[PDB]
Nucleic acid binder design. Sequence first.
RNA 1: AAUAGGUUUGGUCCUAGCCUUUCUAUUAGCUCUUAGUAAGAUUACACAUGCAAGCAUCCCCGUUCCAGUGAGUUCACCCUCUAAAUCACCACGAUCAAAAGGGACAAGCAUCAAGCACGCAGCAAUGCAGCUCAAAACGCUUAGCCUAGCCACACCCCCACGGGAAACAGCAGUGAUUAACCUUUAGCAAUAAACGAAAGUUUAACUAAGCUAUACUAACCCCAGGGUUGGUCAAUUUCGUGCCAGCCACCGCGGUCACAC
RNA 2: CCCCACUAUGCUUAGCCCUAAACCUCAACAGUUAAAUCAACAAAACUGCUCGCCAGAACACUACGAGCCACAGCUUAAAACUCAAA
Lengths: 108, 215, 168, 119, 110, 77
Amino acid sequence: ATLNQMHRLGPPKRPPRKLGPTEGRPQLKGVVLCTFTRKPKKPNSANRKCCRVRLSTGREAVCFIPGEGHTLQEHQIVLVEGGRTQDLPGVKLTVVRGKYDCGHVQKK
Amino acid sequence: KKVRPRLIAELARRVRALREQLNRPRDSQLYAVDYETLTRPFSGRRLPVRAWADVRRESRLLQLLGRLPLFGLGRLVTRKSWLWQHDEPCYWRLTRVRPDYTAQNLDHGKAWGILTFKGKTESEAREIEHVMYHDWRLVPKHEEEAFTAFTPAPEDSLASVPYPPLLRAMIIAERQKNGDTSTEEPMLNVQRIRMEPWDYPAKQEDKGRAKGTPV
Amino acid sequence: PMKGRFPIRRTLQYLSQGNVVFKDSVKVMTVNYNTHGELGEGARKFVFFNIPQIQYKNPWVQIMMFKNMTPSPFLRFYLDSGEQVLVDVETKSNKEIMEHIRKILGKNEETLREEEEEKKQLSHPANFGPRKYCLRECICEVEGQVPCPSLVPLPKEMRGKYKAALKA
Amino acid sequence: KAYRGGHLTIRLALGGCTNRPFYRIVAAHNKCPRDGRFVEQLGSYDPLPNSHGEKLVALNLDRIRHWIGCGAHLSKPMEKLLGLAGFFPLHPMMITNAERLRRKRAREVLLASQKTDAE
Amino acid sequence: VRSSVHARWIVGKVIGTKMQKTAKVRVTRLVLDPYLLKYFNKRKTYFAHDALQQCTVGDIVLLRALPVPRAKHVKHELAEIVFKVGKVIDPVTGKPCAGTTYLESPLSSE
Amino acid sequence: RKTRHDPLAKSKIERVNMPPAVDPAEFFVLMERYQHYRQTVRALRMEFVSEVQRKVHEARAGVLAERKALKDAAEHR
RNA sequence: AAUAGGUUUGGUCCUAGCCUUUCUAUUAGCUCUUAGUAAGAUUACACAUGCAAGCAUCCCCGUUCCAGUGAGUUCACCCUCUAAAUCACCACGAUCAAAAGGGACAAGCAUCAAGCACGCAGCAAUGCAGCUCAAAACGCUUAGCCUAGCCACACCCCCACGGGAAACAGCAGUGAUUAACCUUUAGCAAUAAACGAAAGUUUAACUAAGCUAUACUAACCCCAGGGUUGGUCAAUUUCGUGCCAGCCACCGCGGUCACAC
RNA sequence: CCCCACUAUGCUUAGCCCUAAACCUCAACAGUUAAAUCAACAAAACUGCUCGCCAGAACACUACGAGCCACAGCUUAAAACUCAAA
Ligand code: FES
Ligand SMILES: [K+]
Ligand SMILES: [K+]
Ligand SMILES: [K+]
Ligand SMILES: [K+]
Ligand SMILES: [K+]
Ligand SMILES: [K+]
Ligand SMILES: [K+]
Ligand SMILES: [K+]
Ligand SMILES: [K+]
Ligand SMILES: [Mg+2]
Ligand SMILES: [Mg+2]
Ligand SMILES: [Mg+2]
Ligand SMILES: [Mg+2]
Ligand SMILES: [Mg+2]
Ligand SMILES: [Mg+2]
Ligand SMILES: [Mg+2]
Ligand SMILES: [Mg+2]
Ligand SMILES: [Mg+2]
Ligand SMILES: [Mg+2]
Ligand SMILES: [Mg+2]
Ligand SMILES: [Mg+2]
Ligand SMILES: [Mg+2]
Ligand SMILES: [Mg+2]
Ligand SMILES: [Mg+2]
Ligand SMILES: [Mg+2]
Ligand SMILES: [Mg+2]
Ligand SMILES: [Mg+2]
Ligand SMILES: [Mg+2]
Ligand SMILES: [Mg+2]
Ligand SMILES: [Mg+2]
Ligand SMILES: [Mg+2]
Ligand SMILES: [Mg+2]
Ligand SMILES: [Mg+2]
Ligand SMILES: [Mg+2]
């Protein structure tokens, strides 16, 4: 562009940064509604343990439960953080192991 | 950019100023006192302890003038605090009185007069302060000559004082820098600094007044 | 690279190299020049090279240009008193034009030196405060004075935690 | 922030850290916060003795005289500093507190002697 | 000499004469573009009192600030017509010109 | 600090501020010292006020200011 | 975006997004010795209790400040003029600084493009029909700001006569709420403020303490944990598991020799 | 798709509609062939100046708003969800 055009348009404007599933917050509190397993997209194969929670913001979302084995049940409290599960399309939240009702993974 | 007018603010501002002039408390309300508790029933605030003895023994100015013809215009009134503090005659010569007609005994109001403080009389009359204080005494007619008799003592007061040590050294150092070789000592002129006693009657015209809020 | 011919003109270093600082009387400076003609060449280079430098040093003076309105180029200054100063610039180079206006309406090197000195009086070296305004923030930075407790703990005797303990 | 009335005052603004006080002499509106906005800084005062056993006091006498000439008041600790410097007379309470200290120590010296005499 | 108006002297181009005894003047100033460090024209409108209604759209005028504004938007007065539209007088020679050409040669009056 | 609309504390309703005791000798001596001290400080304040006014007038209509004003006006012509 | 790096393909080059490496802050997990210092509700939601403004021979003066908060938001800056206030009192003055006049002054959206009286002349009567706007008017949305500090607000109705109603966005403290979690300490000794002629009096400002790895500095005979170890990117032995269980920021790993679980 | 028949339509007049791979996919004006000639291909590489336009892919010649003789239309033209490529 010419100098006249650059002067007329002004400095560039960054697109307003989009908030993720945590709405720009480190963690969110949630209530477990149901548990289930999801199949990852190809070429991965597994039954990844997930759950649907009602976030403290009123929104419902699916969350991945990391680690080997969990004991989450309906009406239990969990803390969810960011970070997508790479091979689970649409799953963008992760339960924090060792907080509220979700305990740490049992050794071996 | 044109600020939106705030009409309720101007309206309330005028209504408050109006109610403060039509509901203003009178001297008989503001300056009443309960001699048992030594509190003002208008605000429930106690008087300072150093005033308790005089509040029970001395009279307010209008308590004296309410008993005189024409409210005592032309009479001399002095204060017990002046009689104790100074040996020279201190008194007001009354020229105008505005009594508080709302008082049952007409023992409140305002007064104007000519001040004679420590033997020196002022040139013009002005409003008298502390009219509501319990501190006033009426000078009898057969005692006015002996009470006002005063001979001015010679005002043998100091004329000049030295400068503070550092200021003096800097004034002298500045002389020598500019070539001045004078040996005269720098001196502060204190003749123009007339020190009034702290109990000199202040200007009542420029004094405020308690706002309306009866308890 | 930077756009346009002579991109040096669009640098803060170049703009600060102007030596013309108008006296307080100058309020408007009009420039009448012609786009073509060999005798108006110096006036065109003056508009091209020097006008930015003049405006940079005199931000509150109005500068307005006019093209091909008269047969010859000229400058005209309007002073606060109402006086007008006409300067014929035909045949002169842009450097001779800058030196001319500097002589008749520019502040001399003496007047500018004094102004710079009166500014230095605003930042007294002995004052303490934020780095934006002062050299040092606290007297504890001066060698020999009691240092800051955040770096050198004070003796227990100079601390209120133990002054009150002993007294109490 | 235009205040209702008020006036300029030459006073001490507290700086430094906990147990390490340091004062800046400033001219400021009397209604402003102690350590907040000021009009001009007129000096400083380090109350803690330095390595040479000295309390350092800086006074911008030229500007102090200017602001007094413009109607600025003086806080009581500031008046005592100027008295110690010889710029003002000694404040009446510096003289009186000194006399009180003399009478206080004259009684202690008397009590000490009476105790030794009894011994 | 004092005045509460900010712009004391300004030159501009008359762009409107539809108000009675008032000329609408466009004034341009050079403003530095901070990023590009290039000067660009910044224009502003001023109403100038013209008692004799002598201003024509397109002429260059000199405006003087009034002591106090005479109207909400009228803070200046016409002090002088610098360049009358289509009737310019060369200030350097005092002869009438049409663009970059003389209408009367300077040699006429020596 | 409180505002005039805040209510008075109930634990301070019956508080009576008793004035200090007075030492006649020291009271009188201290009273004379304040008079002399404040007379000297007022004399100093008057001199500082006159200096401030003298410097303002000097910078406005001083001999060096009016002389520099004519010099600048002459150099301009 | 840098001294850059990884990743498009069967392969190359080009273009390009995403991510890695750096530096901070908050929160979470696990873990944690001392000392000094700095800093310290998520919420303009609701608040139990105590305290936070007095002074002074009565009048007055002060409680319009300080302290708090960030809801709203071009009232903050310059010039002109000019009150109140300080200079004891006048100061034809200086200082300080309102109201008023002129100028300047955030971001995003133009799929907000027209606004709808927004001008001028005249002593008036009244006359003219103008004024702003793509160089962004008008409008919507977001946000305290340009930080020696400033602006704004002070339960709500922009305001506060009036009304709703009964007020911690003063200190300490509590309920609810949030990922977010300091003591219902002491003292007016210093400084600051109010008052007093003054000795002085008052002050949850402040000062000195309490609590907390949020940070900085220093230290410790005994006392180390957390995370990583396929490549990017410093660093894996032996087993178990067998596209299962699980793992990664990116590319990817796991189908019986897995340095990736 | 191949063969036959025939209509709207292609034509004229009077009004609309306003689109195209409307692309020679190469903006207008002025100038150069020397330097480093230049990623590849295409139709050699550049300079000055101006206007228009562009900023990962897809969603999308779409939704909504607005304008329009257009009413299954045209012009202007986003976002959410999604991927680590295109
Ligand atoms: S910064 Fe000076 S004492 Fe801490
Ligand atoms: K796989
Ligand atoms: K890349
Ligand atoms: K008082
Ligand atoms: K505040
Ligand atoms: K805010
Ligand atoms: K409000
Ligand atoms: K104190
Ligand atoms: K097209
Ligand atoms: K084509
Ligand atoms: Mg991946
Ligand atoms: Mg491959
Ligand atoms: Mg908020
Ligand atoms: Mg005044
Ligand atoms: Mg103002
Ligand atoms: Mg447009
Ligand atoms: Mg839309
Ligand atoms: Mg706008
Ligand atoms: Mg907000
Ligand atoms: Mg509240
Ligand atoms: Mg309100
Ligand atoms: Mg609180
Ligand atoms: Mg925290
Ligand atoms: Mg206390
Ligand atoms: Mg602390
Ligand atoms: Mg194995
Ligand atoms: Mg492993
Ligand atoms: Mg047919
Ligand atoms: Mg035909
Ligand atoms: Mg064609
Ligand atoms: Mg074109
Ligand atoms: Mg795209
Ligand atoms: Mg189409
Ligand atoms: Mg469409
Ligand atoms: Mg539509």
